[PDB]
Structure 1
Amino acid sequence: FKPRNYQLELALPAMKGKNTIICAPTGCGKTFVSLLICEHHLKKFPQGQKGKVVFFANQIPVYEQQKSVFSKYFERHGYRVTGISGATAENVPVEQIVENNDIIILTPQILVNNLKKGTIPSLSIFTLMIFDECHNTSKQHPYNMIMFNYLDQKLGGSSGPLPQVIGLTASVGVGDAKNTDEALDYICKLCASLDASVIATVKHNLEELEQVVYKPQKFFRKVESRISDKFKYIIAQLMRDTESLAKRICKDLENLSQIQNREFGTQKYEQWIVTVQKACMVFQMPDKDEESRICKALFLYTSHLRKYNDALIISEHARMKDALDYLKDFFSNVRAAGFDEIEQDLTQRFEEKLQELESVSRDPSNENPKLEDLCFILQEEYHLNPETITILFVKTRALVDALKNWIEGNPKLSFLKPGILTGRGKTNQNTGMTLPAQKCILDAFKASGDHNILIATSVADEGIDIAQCNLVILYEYVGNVIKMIQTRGRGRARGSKCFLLTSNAGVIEKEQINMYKEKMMNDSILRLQTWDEAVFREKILHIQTHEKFIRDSQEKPKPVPDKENKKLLCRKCKALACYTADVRVIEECHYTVLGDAFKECFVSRPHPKPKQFSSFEKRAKIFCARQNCSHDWGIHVKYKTFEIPVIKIESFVVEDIATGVQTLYSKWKDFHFEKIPFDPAE
């Protein structure tokens, strides 16, 4: 625990009573700098008053690491260190646990909720508000909401003992600015939103700083794509047959979107299929008998087209065998559900060509040249040095499993052990990885462990304790300047590589302008560090006044809701589920329904990941009680002592009884109606 020569120079502007934007590229250095700043701040206070330094941390793993190191560093002098999260703030007194403690490591959403309902009426209780990854301050971030409350308390005219912002970062970022005159504007806007006048960056001890944060050399591997594609042809033929079968029941199908020319296996086609799906979900017929079957068949057709587009997107970046395995997994998952006349025709049409797909996929003469170049550079780097660890980055969760399967099923490379980690992702699906499943993978990834290469998603981009890699390879990965710095900064070993393998010149141009934006942000920081403290304070005060005027001017009230009785039909089956006359709002965020006429309209299923949000408990997942629907309506929780199902309007269509038209919403804020609050009775 020896303080380095650069950490003192980084903390010297912070030990003056002024808010700082300290930016260090190293990992442990920021933690040691925050600990030294906390140690210096908890000693300047005289007798009769103590400090209330609060260190905000977004992610749970980095929060637990910071809490562990803070306890191990401060539980010797009589400094009570605690920590609040979702598994901590169930029924604890938040104001009491803030009062009787000194270092609070809460998660900023909890603090925003506390400032919202009835807790901590003024932020003058704390005296040192440190942020982890302060560059995440953005349009409506929880960090930005805390800073909005701080700026409101400051400019309200009742500014008392305001705390100090020592929010550390690793990269300020440019965002979307082209020129230096807009990059400096964005940096000044971030520095005003964080309410500071000093941006600390190590300049004197650069020779003693470059020995631990040794940056990797980048290498672009732009190569051509596949020319002979006997897989895309037959998949596009099956997609054309499915589209003609969909157009057999819907005459005006081409006029349901504004797409001029669509290509199969593209993001344009993936947008068009969702557009035509949301267009045919609101189809109306004045019989209400065969309309259900028509919309159900149309939903099945659009689901099959979307899955074929996703399979083509997977096959364009990976092999044909794993794409066939994904299609077979989808067909097996839909096979376990009900089987009508509509699904059986698509299933037999897929089974009539599955043998042809397998015979084309088994041929090793049409493999991906991206995967060939990746295996070539991997075996080259492992022949040059066998003790290299890679944190190879792929963007899609459905493609990191593909990369793991390609690494496992390959006779050319046998020294690679998959250590693939994904992350949480969706909280209402049986996908992704859990916190202990990720922690055991991160602990089992050393220089001598049973893992030498892991296929990371974007979870490894943010603040997380990973081993010192030297073989960063980005397989079709595209990001901003912040993502590029956070990805390049991971390979801080004594000699590393930052390979970028894309089949597009667009991603190479994006990486080139990202490096240009990094150099421009460095020049902008060097220019901004030369300004005086008096002019910069007036500039950030003007920017804060303008932002406060913009925030207080755009106060749009709730419009007058249509006090009508409308029914919420199903999104897939278009069956009568319930009315809007009985919709209860629990905590201005969750919407439930009541009555004995709804309990026989849905079925239950065990939930994959049960947890609690703030006061509920994930008990079951609900589904439509039709013959073959299997539609995710919502979830089933227990509020205080009674179980209620809370639904989402996203899997719903709002049909009006008076007029007869049916609209389509996505979120609950867009739906305006006579919302009755939840009563504990009935």
Structure 2
Amino acid sequence: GTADEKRSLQCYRRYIERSLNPVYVLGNMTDWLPDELRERIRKEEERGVSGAAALFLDAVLQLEARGWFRGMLDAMLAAGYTGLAEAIENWDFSKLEKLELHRQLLKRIEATMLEVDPVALIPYISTCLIDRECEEIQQISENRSKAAGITKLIECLCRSDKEHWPKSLQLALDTTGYYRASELWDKARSYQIELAQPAINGKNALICAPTGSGKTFVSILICEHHFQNMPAGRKAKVVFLATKVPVYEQQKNVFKHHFERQGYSVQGISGESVEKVIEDSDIIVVTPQILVNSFEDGTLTSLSIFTLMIFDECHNTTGNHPYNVLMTRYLEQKFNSASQLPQILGLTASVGVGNAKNIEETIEHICSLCSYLDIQAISTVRENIQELQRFMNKPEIDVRLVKRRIHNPFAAIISNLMSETEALMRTIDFGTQNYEHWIVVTQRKCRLLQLEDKEEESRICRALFICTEHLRKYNDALIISEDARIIDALSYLTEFFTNVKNGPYTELEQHLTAKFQEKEPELIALSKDETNENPKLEELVCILDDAYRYNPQTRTLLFAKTRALVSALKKCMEENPILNYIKPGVLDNRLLIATSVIVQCNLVVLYEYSGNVTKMIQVGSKCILVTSKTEVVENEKCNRYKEEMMNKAVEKIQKWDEETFAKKIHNLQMKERVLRDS
């Protein structure tokens, strides 16, 4: 109709005025609106973008000229409003409605975006925004400021009328590398054969090989040699036990991928009937607690079903662990029934040392484990040590202690602001990746909320995000101050607030920025001191300078604690006269600086890595570890010793003859039944 088209555009008023910027569709409304109303709208756009979309909508609903409604829809498609043209032409706004939760969220998390680069985001989010929206950002972003830019972008992304946009944003944030905001948006080798041999020869094995040498592989080699040399009637079943839920699934898929094609039935039972799955399957990858339960339960009471049990991370076979509960049952089926037990295969990185002080106590520990599993031989690479070590250069870890900064008054000045800000956030343990993680945890909690008074809830979250964002910055700044120079710390915050100001600059944001600037001139004065020199850093620069004389064609990779620090350290190396010669890159360049997580490289230097290293290092040969914490120097000294002792034990055990070994094991199993009867 005509009086129907004006009633139906009045009832759905809200949706149109909260998406359309009218000054884009006014070129193609050239006939029906006068020239005084196309101008008085564009002066209102300068006050309200939605205020302008309420003056255009008014002076259209009073209009009567020949089918202005058809020129509107044509003009809207003209501007680029495809989801509005469909919404108002099919009278179904369900798509524009479903955005209105994501719009409420974005504004809620806007505090997270401040420092995101709108230019780098534009191509990925382009189909969401209108023609002249895209190019207005670009102007603000270049001419004025990058924060003023991203603020404008997220204005327009709320005024977006395109169901696909929240998805496009998520892929935008993912690909441009803004993981934080994004996450918040929602045939064998020789040594391998050697390892497998005793198990191929039917013996209950415990494969002790290091991680990444390919234990899962040898285990699938053992399998295709188990089905192959399976005698007479008996059909083979195999059980692959894995401790953790993900570990389990990677394997379930490994075995699925490899063995299904050969004709086998490969299923994987897990926490999320046992009987049929087991007898219909040729290979079964499983969580251990599933067997234990469906044994005690009664679904299965015969461990003779399987011809081979593989135990991943088998050093867990002690105490109440289900492997030990499953092997408890295995050991009475050996003793009592004397029927047909399966072959055992144990896979482990390291059999451990328990509480052993000596190689003697260790042997007793290692043996004890082997008893629990009923092992007959411990398989470790011994002939192809050459080939293994080549296949994975376990770096030697030259570990350096390094004196740190005794007083850090910048630190204390920041801490107090963090404490104030926390307590202000309460109205509505610092310098650590604990704190970092705490913010990530607190933020995901505001992302959720969605409680009752959405307007009051909108303001409470908005605020919580501002604060957590600031705390996170301050947090990052302390760290910068402790591993890098104090000027890098100060800078880092200065540059932040200079953004905060260019951003939306909320009532709160003002306060905080103010509260900082109160303290500013102290911090400034701290940077200017020859007192802000940071020996920890001086030591790293001297480790590096030593690392370019015993070899000046060295190609170093240096791991810093945070991102913030990579950029801080980059300056620090540039400015230092000791690494005068060296210009440092970031992730021609012989000193690349990356952060704690495939660049070709020479010597690796971990700069305060809280935790073990060989694991960090795999995502040639030479590796330094600069810590200030003795705790970690005497920790990863205590490991070297316990691993080196374990090996002496294992090789000593390996040099026994079958007889002694199978007997020793057999004793320890016996002593255990003798302590079950008492």
TM-score by length of 2: 0.51
| Alpha carbons of structure 1 residues 367 and 118: separation in structure 2 relative to 1, 3 Å | farther
Candidates 329, 344, 347, aligned match of 1:168: 347
Give 1:102 deviation, angstroms.
Answer: 1.2
Partner of 2:628: 503
Partner of 2:262: 77
Partner of 2:58: none
Alignment of 1:401-412 (within 5 A): 403=565, 406=568, 412=574
Distance in 2 (alpha carbons) for counterparts of 1:348 and 1:546: 73
Give 1:151 deviation, angstroms.
Answer: 1.5
Larger displacement relative to structure 2 (127-136 or 105-114):
105-114
Partner of 1:96: 276
In the alignment, structure 1 residue 384 sits paired with structure 2 residue 553: yes
Partner of 1:180: 359
Q: Deviations over 1:490-545 (max 9, x none)?
A: 49xxx212211111444333333432333222211111112233443343344445
Candidates 226, 230, 237, aligned match of 1:52: 237
In the alignment, structure 1 residue 32 sits paired with structure 2 residue 157: no
Give the counterpart letter for 1:151 in structure 2.
Answer: T
Alignment of 1:568-583 (within 5 A): none
In the alignment, structure 1 residue 149 sits paired with structure 2 residue 329: no
Describe the SS at the equivalent of 1:82: strand
Q: Deviations over 1:52-76 (max 9, x none)?
A: 1122334566555544543444334
Distance in 2 (alpha carbons) for counterparts of 1:548 and 1:346: 69
| Alpha carbons of structure 1 residues 240 and 74: separation in structure 2 relative to 1, 3 Å | closer
Distance in 2 (alpha carbons) for counterparts of 1:117 and 1:383: 67
Partner of 1:537: 662
In the alignment, structure 1 residue 199 sits paired with structure 2 residue 384: no
Give the counterpart letter for 2:632 in structure 1.
Answer: V
Partner of 1:618: none
Partner of 1:128: 308
Partner of 1:190: 369
Give the counterpart letter for 1:510 in structure 2.
Answer: N
| Alpha carbons of structure 1 residues 416 and 311: separation in structure 2 relative to 1, 3 Å | closer
Alignment of 1:261-300 (within 5 A): none
Distance in 1 (alpha carbons) for counterparts of 2:281 and 2:527: 63
Partner of 2:287: 107
Distance in 1 (alpha carbons) for counterparts of 2:294 and 2:391: 40
Describe the SS at the equivalent of 1:41: coil
Distance in 1 (alpha carbons) for counterparts of 2:283 and 2:615: 28
Distance in 2 (alpha carbons) for counterparts of 1:65 and 1:240: 44
Q: Is the 8 A contact 1:393 1:456 kept in 2?
A: yes
Q: Is the 8 A contact 2:476 2:564 kept in 1?
A: no
Distance in 1 (alpha carbons) for counterparts of 2:214 and 2:375: 21
Give 1:42 deviation, angstroms.
Answer: 1.0
Structure 1 residue runs without a partner (length 5+): 246-262, 268-304, 333-338, 340-344, 419-451, 458-465, 554-682
Distance in 1 (alpha carbons) for counterparts of 2:410 and 2:279: 65
| Alpha carbons of structure 1 residues 351 and 208: separation in structure 2 relative to 1, 3 Å | closer
Q: Is the 8 A contact 1:115 1:121 kept in 2?
A: yes
Give 1:41 deviation, angstroms.
Answer: 0.8
Q: Deviations over 1:297-335 (max 9, x none)?
A: xxxxxxxx9x99999788545676779879x99xx9xxx
Describe the SS at the equivalent of 2:623: strand
| Alpha carbons of structure 1 residues 309 and 401: separation in structure 2 relative to 1, 3 Å | closer
Q: Is the 8 A contact 1:322 1:402 kept in 2?
A: no
| Alpha carbons of structure 1 residues 353 and 486: separation in structure 2 relative to 1, 3 Å | closer
Give the counterpart letter for 1:476 in structure 2.
Answer: E
Give the counterpart letter for 1:516 in structure 2.
Answer: Y
Give 1:38 deviation, angstroms.
Answer: 0.6
Distance in 1 (alpha carbons) for counterparts of 2:314 and 2:283: 18
Q: Is the 8 A contact 2:242 2:248 kept in 1?
A: yes
Distance in 1 (alpha carbons) for counterparts of 2:538 and 2:676: 53
| Alpha carbons of structure 1 residues 476 and 127: separation in structure 2 relative to 1, 3 Å | farther
| Alpha carbons of structure 1 residues 349 and 172: separation in structure 2 relative to 1, 3 Å | same
Distance in 2 (alpha carbons) for counterparts of 1:486 and 1:384: 27
Structure 2 residue runs without a partner (length 5+): 1-186, 424-428, 434-470, 501-506, 575-581
| Alpha carbons of structure 1 residues 153 and 209: separation in structure 2 relative to 1, 3 Å | closer
Q: Is the 8 A contact 1:484 1:514 kept in 2?
A: no
Structure with the bigger percentage of helix: 2
Q: Is the 8 A contact 2:403 2:628 kept in 1?
A: yes
Q: Is the 8 A contact 1:151 1:544 kept in 2?
A: no
In the alignment, structure 1 residue 215 sits paired with structure 2 residue 381: no
In the alignment, structure 1 residue 10 sits paired with structure 2 residue 200: no
Distance in 2 (alpha carbons) for counterparts of 1:126 and 1:233: 63
Give the counterpart letter for 1:520 in structure 2.
Answer: M
Partner of 1:524: 649
| Alpha carbons of structure 1 residues 453 and 230: separation in structure 2 relative to 1, 3 Å | closer
Give the counterpart letter for 1:185 in structure 2.
Answer: E
| Alpha carbons of structure 1 residues 206 and 378: separation in structure 2 relative to 1, 3 Å | same
| Alpha carbons of structure 1 residues 206 and 417: separation in structure 2 relative to 1, 3 Å | same
Count of residue correspondences: 440
| Alpha carbons of structure 1 residues 352 and 519: separation in structure 2 relative to 1, 3 Å | same
Q: Is the 8 A contact 1:217 1:498 kept in 2?
A: yes
Give the counterpart letter for 2:360 in structure 1.
Answer: D
Q: Is the 8 A contact 2:570 2:584 kept in 1?
A: no
Partner of 1:476: 608
Distance in 1 (alpha carbons) for counterparts of 2:676 and 2:613: 31
Give the counterpart letter for 2:266 in structure 1.
Answer: V
Q: Is the 8 A contact 1:25 1:213 kept in 2?
A: no
Q: Which has the larger radius of gyration?
A: 2
Q: Is the 8 A contact 1:123 1:150 kept in 2?
A: no
Larger displacement relative to structure 2 (62-71 or 94-103):
62-71
Distance in 2 (alpha carbons) for counterparts of 1:346 and 1:154: 67
TM-score by length of 1: 0.50
Partner of 1:634: none
Q: Is the 8 A contact 2:483 2:565 kept in 1?
A: no
Q: Deviations over 1:206-247 (max 9, x none)?
A: 34444323332332232210145222444677899999x9xx
Give 1:133 deviation, angstroms.
Answer: 3.2
Give the counterpart letter for 1:164 in structure 2.
Answer: Q
In the alignment, structure 1 residue 230 sits paired with structure 2 residue 409: yes
Q: Deviations over 1:343-390 (max 9, x none)?
A: xx999987854664576479897364445655776796897355x7x6
Q: Is the 8 A contact 1:478 1:510 kept in 2?
A: no
Same amino acid, percent of matched pairs = 50
Describe the SS at the equivalent of 2:624: strand
Q: Is the 8 A contact 1:74 1:81 kept in 2?
A: yes
| Alpha carbons of structure 1 residues 354 and 114: separation in structure 2 relative to 1, 3 Å | farther
Partner of 1:653: none
Give 1:188 deviation, angstroms.
Answer: 2.1
Give 1:114 deviation, angstroms.
Answer: 4.2
Describe the SS at the equivalent of 2:375: coil
Describe the SS at the equivalent of 1:167: strand
Distance in 2 (alpha carbons) for counterparts of 1:152 and 1:82: 24
Distance in 2 (alpha carbons) for counterparts of 1:109 and 1:348: 57
Structure with higher RCO (Cα < 8 A, 6+ apart):
1
